[PDB]
PDB file of C-alpha atoms in Angstrom:
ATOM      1  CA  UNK A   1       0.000   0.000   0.000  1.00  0.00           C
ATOM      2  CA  UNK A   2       1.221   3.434  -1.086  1.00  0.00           C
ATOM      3  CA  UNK A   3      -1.653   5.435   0.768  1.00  0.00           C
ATOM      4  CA  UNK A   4      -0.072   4.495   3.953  1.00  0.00           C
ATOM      5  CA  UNK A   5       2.291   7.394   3.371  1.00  0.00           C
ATOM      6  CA  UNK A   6      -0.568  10.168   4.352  1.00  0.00           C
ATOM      7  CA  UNK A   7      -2.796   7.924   5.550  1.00  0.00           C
ATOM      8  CA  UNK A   8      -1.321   5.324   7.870  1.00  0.00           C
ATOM      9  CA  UNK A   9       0.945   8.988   8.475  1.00  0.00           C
ATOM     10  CA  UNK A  10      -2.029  10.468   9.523  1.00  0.00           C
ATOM     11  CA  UNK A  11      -1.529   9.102  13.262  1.00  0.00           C
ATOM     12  CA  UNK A  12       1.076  11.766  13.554  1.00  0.00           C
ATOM     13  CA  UNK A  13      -0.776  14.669  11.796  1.00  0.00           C
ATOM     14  CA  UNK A  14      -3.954  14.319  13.881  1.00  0.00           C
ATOM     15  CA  UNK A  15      -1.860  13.427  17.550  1.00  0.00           C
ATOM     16  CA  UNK A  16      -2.210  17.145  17.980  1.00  0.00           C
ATOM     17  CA  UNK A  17      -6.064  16.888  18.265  1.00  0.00           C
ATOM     18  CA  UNK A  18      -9.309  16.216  20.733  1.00  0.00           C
ATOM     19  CA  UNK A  19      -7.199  14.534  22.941  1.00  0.00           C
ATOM     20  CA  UNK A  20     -11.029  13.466  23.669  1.00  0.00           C
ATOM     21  CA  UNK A  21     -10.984  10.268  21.463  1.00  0.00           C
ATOM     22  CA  UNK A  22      -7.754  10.458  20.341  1.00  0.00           C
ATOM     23  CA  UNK A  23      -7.363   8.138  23.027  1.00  0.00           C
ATOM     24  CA  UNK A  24      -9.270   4.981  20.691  1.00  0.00           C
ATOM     25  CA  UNK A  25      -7.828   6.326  17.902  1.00  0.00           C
ATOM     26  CA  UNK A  26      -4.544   6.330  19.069  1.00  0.00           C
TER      27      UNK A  26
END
């Protein structure tokens, strides 16, 4: 998979966000 280079990425783009469920996203 190529996407994973924004998407599976995208952990560390959105970490600085609602901390709300960022915990079950995490």
């Amino acid at each position: 998979y190529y996407h994973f280079w924004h998407r599976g990425v995208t952990k560390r783009s959105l970490s600085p966000h609602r901390p709300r469920h960022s915990r079950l996203q995490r």
